[PDB]
Design a protein around this ligand. Structure first.
Ligand SMILES: Nc1ncnc2c1ncn2[C@@H]1O[C@H](COP(=O)(O)OP(=O)(O)OP(=O)(O)O)[C@@H](O)[C@H]1O
Ligand SMILES: [Mg+2]
Lengths: 468, 498, 50, 69, 466
């Protein structure tokens, strides 16, 4: 304990400790910083004669060299238990809501814990109904399994996440944890607060069953780097005692970007496009903790931001192998005013198996993909020549594909703020029936424009009758 | 029994890489021990990779959060090695041989060192014995033989692991000891694979070596050489399987792109100079060392074999990347799986146009070789004529019938999951299809026709299947004897149904 | 066959417990002796054997 | 000089500390011997000089574990 | 002349020698292993004071930081002579076959030698008589030249190599050398050793007339880098003896890749796409030894693998800068039962000009490949027209093109014991005369399947009359 700061490079602080009291790899050291409030750094490396390199996870832009640092001797500890329910925390576990601090009697758990072993893994999963046609048909939201949506900058990842929460957080049958590792403090939070506090479950709000840890974009790289681990530690307590947990981590890519900035400041050799050499290991350490085990189940739902529109970027490429259900949002689909913007061809799921989701559901999904696969094959032919050169069956499949593409669009109850269309909740059975009817041939006479932003097939038929 | 061992001190521990200061007379790939201390009651091993002057940079095979500056490291004289032998069959072991399935300690007596030179230059032999994948497309168009390293390359999610698992399941009684090496694969997925293997009883001859993503990059780096050493021991000494000394091994590296990523991580953390795409310079040497150990030794050296199936994911189907091109150069064959074919209903999703097997017909049974030549020719010509099929509607009856036949064959290759077809069944189906017995069957019902035909042979005429399997090795497979009682069975099935 | 494998794997587990138990009790025979009687000078010479 | 280190569970007499010191002075010279107790290590013939260490008191117990397993 | 190892980073070993006994730049090191044998390293860089940086040529998984090293004084010395004939060697020249070691009486020559001077280079290119009709007509070789093969497996590349070895061993002395540079151990070995030991000519196996040096992909980058130079040394001995030599380098691109890996491990900065800065010079130091002097010639027939299909890649570009002809074996021709799958198109040569081969040879080689210049583009019109029931001249040109395509096949003396047909050796004059007569029209009035597998047009006429 009682070291001194040697260098302050960005948010990376190199401190010198006595020879026999060097902090451990992941210990949390503190600068008094004056004013009675301290800056909690996390060690990352040990460089030699008592010299350690720590990540500030704070402003670290008003402190000098030679400042003393106090070694706590333990990694970052965050409160866990029912006391964390309905509260908002930092990466450090310090509450930021108007309510008081967590009492000392509440257990503090280190945010760096080993992921569940191979024995503890629970492979049992089943479809989690969500009411979104494209999600519940092509890439079923998996209960007890990791799933994530990959979108660019203009697509509505946040809208989809908010609608999903509105649909499924009321009938939770358990607590939930939200972690915006990297997201706008406007819509990622302080507006999800209003939505969650407005929703009421038998005189108890949804927010009364939720633990929320942000580390918003504004925060320095350390907070965005470790906020995911804080949320995971807060949710593992509830998973370990059997409670079903809904976990919503927003923009894992921001966690990766924070890791990249920290690594760049740490002097590590860059890999690929400026990313950290330890990208795969960091992703493994975070993601392998998001697992439903034999003691409890975590129904994770993540979001991933692709830089520019590159799906070959190392961060989404690393995420892709850590998921059960993959949802891909495309810029072109969104620019075609299809707000869900999900690409069925590039979106898959593990539980899209007839033994799990249902034989009819599986057949319908496979046909809805074989169509639009024919369409992707004939895209160039249509673009340069036109519909006429195709054969009759090819033509029919093409307009069926366009009708399906239009029909995947669905109004969202959270889209009322900029769209006047009321939201719709289409059950998975209704979605399967509607798409089976559409593929049978029913609805062929209906023009494609009638499938835009509708509910089930009955709503499309009713609109067609209204317009005669 | 007092012994004196050289020790050094950890002077700098970082992201799983430690500098060990004075470890004179350390071998270039030892296993430094990091003995247990206050707070750590176990030992954390490491590999002394860089033997620099006045410093030994050693990666760590485990959690580096416990190694602290000033700790002692005892240089165990043994180069990195893994337990091997009979005791590993049916166990999930991390690349160090320590069981992780919690079914008890691994029983063994021999530890074959990983990272060994190739089996030999003249010690090998021509690949002749086929590896029955159980998939019609692979077994007919892109054959895999014992001792041939066949790459499974595709997009992120197209069926690569599914194909590898189907191959592993199919080797029930074919005297093979399958090995599944999971590198950088999430622990839940490895649990799913183990559950699938146990469900079909395929964990009585399979060794699963798993180095999941959370585990240190060194474990993923040595993940494929573990397992490859296990297969080397199987092909050189044999393991007692079903009362028969099996000396054939089949190893599946679940993803070599993740292994290359792990090697890049451990190299960059060691501050070695990068190369193309930030990968270290000798990544081709990496994978060549890994893959050239798969060989079919001659009868003088044991006659064993080790079949490797590297798996590679390609970003946006970019085959011309660095690791995909390297491993394409290394391997003897490629199996391209496309998302476009996978979505279009072709479940195995093989791109037979560009998938190649350099071993060729030598890795097929004589029945399969005699029947699949017409298959390959007709499929290639159908692929050629697809250009006219897409647009032209005025083509003659010959071209229309030929496109129809191509569609018949393509629908024949549409195999479901976890339903491998034995060699006799594939031979029978392909003989029926290539001899015009299937022409009157409409395309949408060909898969159902094949399933019903297989039920027919399994129930009505087991003797024709026994006859086909018995004489599948003769130079002229279509003998009038095998020719009869097979065309008769097809005719009976055609007459009875539809 | 699985039942035979289950039986034999329990024997190894039982043997492993015996090996673990005997060493823990080996701390009773001599490690507990180190409280009062185990303090020895000839053992210190054994360190200086080399 | 050469930095040596020896550890033992028993806290031998202060004279015993000197006895440890001069039995090593015969090799090389004024070696800076560092003393610890290691309560978790109930034994150990710990003689660490330079980059070489000698140790077997409880390692024999561990060696007995290796034999039985 | 004894030093100590300082650093061991992968396959790069840094050794410190006494100040006045530093090894030369390309000398060997021969680190002695405990179990009797030695690890032969090759110096690459003298640096500092008495310190040399060397490439391993071996595993280096058992070396400490104090092992002594025994400088040899000379570069890697390899056995050369008639003793090293019909044997298989590694990069160091140690025979890896089952037979015994090479006796000390055999002369050892340094692996690194300067290419022949400009004064000794032939001032006029000379065609190399291979005997294969398609090879000697469309894409003739060059005495002391280079030729590339672009074809996978199953197209008979190995059989073409065997036929070339047999022809050069029969017509001339034709001692052949095969260099396995970074090739698959299954294809390069035990499918070349067996297919050449089984293959025979005048009760003498092809393997007995060929020297094989094999550095496979499993070997460290230095081994794959210097295996080519070992093969060149063996061939250069016989060239100095005055005998024409046919040298095969399998996957010279793997030699380039080995050079790139060696440079990356040696600390050199990368050039272009990670390749070594000394790419052109490294290619020159090897390909320039493949030349035809006055006393003898080393003709080379290399195989080139392009990563993906990228010919813009620096390795194929540097390889092609040192090429005189290309031969493109084709899958379609191979699967049409025409065993020599040399595509009439896409098989060029810089000898195909009137001033070397002759006016008649160029004329006949231009009349052919002109009816095929379209690749018989008439196939599409037949496909969508049913030949239109009449094509006038096009029917004659199609018949002639099919006749020539069938006629390009030639019996293999190495496949005589497989297909049961004697092999015919066709000189270049016979090729040009036969094709001149065929284009004039003497091949007409004769149906197909009579030009399928024959040596000369005279043989076709004899078959027709019988
Ligand atoms: N008949 C089939 N053959 C192959 N794959 C199939 C078949 N039927 C369905 N599939 C799909 O293949 C999946 C199996 O995983 P797959 O082999 O595609 O993974 P992968 O290529 O290793 O990808 P990942 O990057 O997700 O690990 C199933 O979940 C299903 O989506
Ligand atoms: Mg997989």
């Amino acid at each position: 304990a009682k070291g001194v700061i040697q260098e302050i490079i960005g948010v990376v602080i190199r401190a010198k400790f006595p020879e026999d009291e060097v902090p451990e790899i992941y210990n949390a050291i503190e600068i008094p910083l004056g004013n009675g409030d301290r800056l909690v750094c996390e060690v990352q490396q040990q460089l030699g004669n008592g010299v350690v390199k720590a990540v500030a996870m704070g402003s670290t832009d008003g402190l000098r060299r030679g400042l003393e640092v106090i070694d706590t001797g333990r990694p970052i500890a965050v409160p866990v238990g029912p006391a964390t329910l309905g509260r908002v925390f930092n990466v450090l576990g310090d509450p930021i809501d108007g309510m008081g601090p967590i009492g000392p009697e509440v257990e503090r758990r280190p945010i760096h814990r080993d992921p569940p072993s191979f024995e503890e893994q629970n492979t049992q999963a089943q479809i989690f109904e969500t009411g979104i046609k494209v999600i519940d048909l092509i890439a079923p939201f998996t209960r007890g399994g990791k799933t994530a949506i990959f979108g660019g900058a203009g697509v509505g990842k946040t809208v989809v996440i908010q609608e999903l929460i509105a649909n499924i957080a009321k009938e939770q049958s358990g607590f939930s944890v939200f972690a915006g590792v990297g997201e706008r403090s406007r819509e990622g939070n302080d507006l999800i607060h209003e939505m969650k506090e407005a929703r009421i479950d038998e005189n108890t709000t949804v927010f009364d069953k939720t633990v929320m840890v942000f580390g918003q974009m504004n925060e320095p790289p350390g907070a965005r780097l470790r906020v995911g681990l804080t949320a995971l530690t807060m949710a593992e307590y509830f998973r370990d005692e059997g409670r079903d947990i809904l976990l919503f981590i927003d923009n894992i890519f921001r966690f990766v970007q924070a890791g990249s900035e920290v690594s760049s400041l740490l002097g590590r050799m860059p890999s690929q496009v400026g990313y950290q050499p330890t990208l795969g290991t960091e992703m493994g350490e975070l993601q392998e903790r998001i697992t439903s085990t034999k003691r409890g189940s975590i129904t994770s739902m993540q979001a991933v931001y692709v830089p520019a529109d590159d799906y070959t970027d190392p961060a989404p490429a690393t995420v892709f192998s850590h998921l059960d259900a993959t949802i891909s949002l495309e810029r072109s689909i969104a620019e075609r005013a299809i707000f869900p913007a999900v690409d069925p061809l590039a979106s898959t799921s593990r539980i899209l198996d007839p033994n799990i989701v249902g034989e009819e559901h599986y057949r319908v999904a496979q046909e809805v993909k074989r169509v639009l696969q024919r369409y992707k094959d004939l895209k160039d032919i249509i673009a340069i020549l036109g519909m006429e050169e195709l054969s009759d069956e090819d033509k029919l499949t093409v307009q069926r594909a366009r009708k399906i593409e239009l029909f995947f669009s669905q109004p969202f109850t959270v889209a009322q703020q900029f769209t006047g269309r009321p939201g719709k909740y289409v059950p998975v059975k209704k979605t399967v029936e509607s798409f089976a009817r559409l593929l049978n041939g029913e609805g062929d006479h209906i023009p494609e424009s009638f499938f835009y932003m509708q509910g089930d097939f009955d709503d499309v038929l009713a609109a067609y009758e209204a317009s005669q | 029994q007092p012994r004196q061992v050289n020790v050094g001190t950890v002077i700098a521990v970082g992201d799983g890489v430690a500098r060990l200061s004075g470890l004179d007379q350390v071998v270039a790939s030892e296993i430094v021990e990091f003995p247990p201390k206050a707070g750590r009651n176990e030992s954390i091993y490491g590999i002394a990779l860089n033997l620099e002057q006045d410093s030994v940079a050693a990666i760590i095979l485990g959690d580096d959060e416990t190694i602290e500056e000033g700790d002692m490291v005892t240089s165990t004289g043994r180069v990195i090695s893994v337990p091997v032998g009979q005791g590993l069959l049916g166990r999930v072991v991390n690349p160090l041989g320590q069981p992780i399935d919690g079914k008890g300690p691994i029983v063994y007596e021999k530890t074959r060192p990983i990272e060994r030179i190739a089996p030999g230059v003249i010690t090998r032999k021509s690949v002749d014995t086929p590896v029955q994948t159980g998939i019609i497309a692979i077994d007919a168009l892109i054959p895999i033989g014992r001792g041939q390293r066949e790459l499974i390359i595709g997009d992120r999610q197209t069926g690569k692991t599914a194909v590898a698992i189907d191959t592993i399941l199919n080797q029930k009684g074919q005297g093979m000891v399958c090995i599944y090496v999971a590198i950088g694969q999430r622990r839940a997925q490895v649990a799913q694979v183990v559950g699938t293997l146990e469900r079909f009883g395929a964990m009585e001859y399979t060794i699963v070596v798993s180095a999941t993503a959370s585990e240190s990059a060194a474990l993923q780096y040595i993940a494929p050489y573990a397992g490859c050493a296990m297969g080397e021991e199987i092909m050189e000494n044999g393991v007692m399987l079903n009362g028969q000394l099996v000396k054939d091994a089949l190893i599946v590296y679940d993803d070599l792109s993740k292994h290359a990523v792990a090697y890049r991580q451990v190299s960059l953390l060691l501050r070695r100079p990068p190369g193309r795409e930030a990968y270290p310079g000798d990544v081709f040497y990496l994978h060549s060392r890994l893959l050239e150990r798969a060989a079919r030794l001659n009868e003088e050296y044991g006659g064993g074999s080790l079949t490797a199936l590297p798996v590679i994911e390609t970003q946006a189907n970019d085959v011309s990347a660095y690791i995909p091109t390297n491993v394409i150069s290394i391997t003897d064959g490629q199996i391209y799986l496309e998302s476009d074919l996978f979505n279009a209903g072709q479940r195995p999703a093989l791109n037979v146009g560009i998938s190649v097997s350099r071993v060729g017909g030598a890795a097929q049974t004589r029945a399969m070789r005699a029947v699949a030549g017409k298959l390959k020719g007709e499929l290639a010509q159908f692929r050629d004529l697809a250009a006219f099929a897409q647009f032209a509607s005025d083509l003659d009856a010959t071209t229309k019938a030929q496109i129809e036949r191509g569609q018949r064959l393509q629908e024949l290759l549409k195999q479901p999951q976890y339903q491998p077809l034995p060699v006799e069944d594939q031979v029978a189906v392909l003989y029926a299809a290539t001899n015009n017995y299937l022409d009157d069957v409409p395309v949408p019902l060909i898969t159902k026709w094949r399933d019903d035909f297989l039920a027919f042979l399994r129930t009505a005429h087991p003797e024709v299947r026994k006859l086909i399997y018995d004489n599948r090795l003769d130079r002229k497979f279509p003998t009038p004897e095998v020719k009869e009682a097979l065309e008769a069975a097809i005719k009976e099935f055609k007459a009875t149904s539809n | 066959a699985q039942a035979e494998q289950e039986r034999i794997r329990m024997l190894s587990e039982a043997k492993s417990q015996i090996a673990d138990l005997v060493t823990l009790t080996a701390s009773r025979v001599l490690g507990a002796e180190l409280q009062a009687r185990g303090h020895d000078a000839l053992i210190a010479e054994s360190l200086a054997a080399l | 000089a050469v930095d040596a280190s020896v550890t033992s569970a028993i806290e031998l007499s202060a004279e015993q500390k000197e006895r440890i010191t001069r039995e090593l002075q015969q090799r090389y010279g004024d070696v800076h011997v560092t003393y610890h107790v290691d309560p978790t290590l109930i034994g150990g013939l710990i003689i660490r000089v330079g980059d070489q260490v000698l140790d077997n008191s409880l390692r024999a117990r561990l060696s007995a574990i290796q034999r039985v397993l």
